[PDB]
Design a binder for this molecule. Structure first.
Ligand SMILES: [Cl-]
Ligand SMILES: [Cl-]
Ligand SMILES: [Cl-]
Ligand SMILES: [Cl-]
Ligand SMILES: [Pt+2]
Length: 204
């Protein structure tokens, strides 16, 4: 009798969280909580990315759960906890990884049958991503003005273009004054960012 491909300990974790025939969203939520996290955490994005999720609420195939953890040398909950802790450090320190996870976040949380995410959910993640502990340095007043602009101008969904480009925009112009002084409306930035620029101009 040949030994199993995957350690007994590892298949035991999968079997613990599976709901009937699927490792579904409820499985993921309970698993994340046992790892020490909440669904909304940026660390959860790192976990989902590691496991190869395309959509947050899509079931995770047994083989994908096992092969992923096996390749990372993890068989137990404690091993998996150490892995995510390592990814979380990388999210804080590694600009390439940070940019990758920032971009990944949009498609992961996107509907089934939508092109855009809700503004509420965008702001929820933006408030996490643009904290000082992460690689992109910017003034809090600017981030706040962005949220206020979206609310005030009735911007209720956010597109992939707005999402991806905002990261570049805040990196390039990390302060309201720098946007005021230096932004060029002819430079082919998203229209929504042109609108934000004009909003900032009007508040001066
Ligand atoms: Cl884009
Ligand atoms: Cl572009
Ligand atoms: Cl680009
Ligand atoms: Cl970019
Ligand atoms: Pt871009």
């Amino acid at each position: 009798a040949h030994p199993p491909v995957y350690p007994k300990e590892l298949t035991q974790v999968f079997e613990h969280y599976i709901n009937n025939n699927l490792f579904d969203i409820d499985s993921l939520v309970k698993f994340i909580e046992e790892l020490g996290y909440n669904l909304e955490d940026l660390a959860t994005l790192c976990l989902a990315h590691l496991l190869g999720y395309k959509k947050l609420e899509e079931p995770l195939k047994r083989e994908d759960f096992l092969s992923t953890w096996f390749m990372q040398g993890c068989s137990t909950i404690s091993d998996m906890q150490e892995c995510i802790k390592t990814l979380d450090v990388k999210l804080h320190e590694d600009l390439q990884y940070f940019t990758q996870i920032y971009n990944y976040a949009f498609n992961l949380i996107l509907d089934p049958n939508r092109k855009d995410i809700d503004t509420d959910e965008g702001i929820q993640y933006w408030k996490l991503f643009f904290q000082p502990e992460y690689p992109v340095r910017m003034e809090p007043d600017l981030l706040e003005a962005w949220f206020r602009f979206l609310r005030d101008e009735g911007k209720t969904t956010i597109s992939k273009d707005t999402w991806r480009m905002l990261l570049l925009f805040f990196k390039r112009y990390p302060t309201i004054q720098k946007i005021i002084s230096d932004y060029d409306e002819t430079a082919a930035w998203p229209f929504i960012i042109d609108e934000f620029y004009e909003c900032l101009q009007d508040q001066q």
